[PDB]
Amino acid sequence: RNIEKSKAVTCLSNRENIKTQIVIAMAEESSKDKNEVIKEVLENKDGKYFETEPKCKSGGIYSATFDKVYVTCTKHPDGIEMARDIHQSMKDLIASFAQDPSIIPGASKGNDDFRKYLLDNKYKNGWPTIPDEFKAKYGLSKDTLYIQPYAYNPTKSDATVVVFANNKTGGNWYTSLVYDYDEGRWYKGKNGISVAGRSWDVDTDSVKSVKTEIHSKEGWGPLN
Ligand SMILES: [Zn+2]
User: Fold this and answer.
1) Interatomic CA distance for residues 128 and 109, integer angstroms
2) Alpha carbon distance, N-terminus to C-terminus of the chain
3) Residue 64 Cα, ligand 1 centroid: separation in angstroms?
């Protein structure tokens, strides 16, 4: 129904509001336990944070963590969490390879082979996808948008990981949606950029890192 989709959109906005209030609350009492800060925001202690305790209309239960602040709902999978999880799985795999080349089977130890490992061993139903409510809110495509990693130089000491989303499950490194892992934000532009063949965040004289580019290219900006 339009009811269920609305519940999903509403919950997303809830989680973003929870995130902002937690962030503000932590900056307020900088020297007090963060889990306790999170608990009071979630429960709307003394009506201080919201008009009422945030509740998911689909009956989900909210959680929030501190690394940067992230919020989840047990009934509404969140695209930022999915991106973070993908980013960390690739980072773990890169660290594992650094101790043991054989963790990737076969002769080829490239980005596609690291991704294949992730698909075979963890994401067995394929890459996770950007939730419809996030797409509706932020003006993204009806197309299924696959949240997925690109590993730059995964066998080397300057390995980096970028998570992005496009309508392909592989073989296309151009994207208009890039997840900036450092900011907790998706970036969107209308002209796609390639995430391949260059570092997430180390610029050279002639080749700007993906991160530099998403923050400086024209038509590019933050979404959430
Ligand atoms: Zn929810």
Assistant:
1) 23
2) 25
3) 13
What is the Å distance from ligand 1's center to 13 Cα? 10
Please check whether residues 98 and 35 belong to one and the same domain. Answer: no
Looking at the DSSP bridge assignments, the partners of residue 150 are 162
Range of the domain at 14: 1-77
Could you tell me the distance, in angstroms and rounded to a whole number, from the CA of residue 61 to the centre of ligand 1? 7
Q: What are phi and psi of 197, to 5 degrees?
A: 70, 10
Resolution in Å, one decimal place:
2.0
CATH assignment at residue 62 = 3.30.1300.80
- DSSP conformation letters of 43-86: HTGGG-SSSS----TT---EEEEE--EEEEETTB--HHHHHHHH
Ligand 1 centre from 81 Cα, in Å? 14
In three-state secondary structure terms, 95 is helix
Please tell me the distance between residue 4's alpha carbon and the centre of ligand 1 in angstroms.
Answer: 10
Half-sphere exposure of 223 (CA within 13 A, CB side): 22
For 152, the token pair is 């730059």
The one-character DSSP state at 129 is B
Q: Experimentally, how was this structure solved?
A: X-ray
Cα–ligand 1 centroid distance for 171 (angstroms): 33
Are 66 and 72 a contacting pair, CB within 8 Å? no
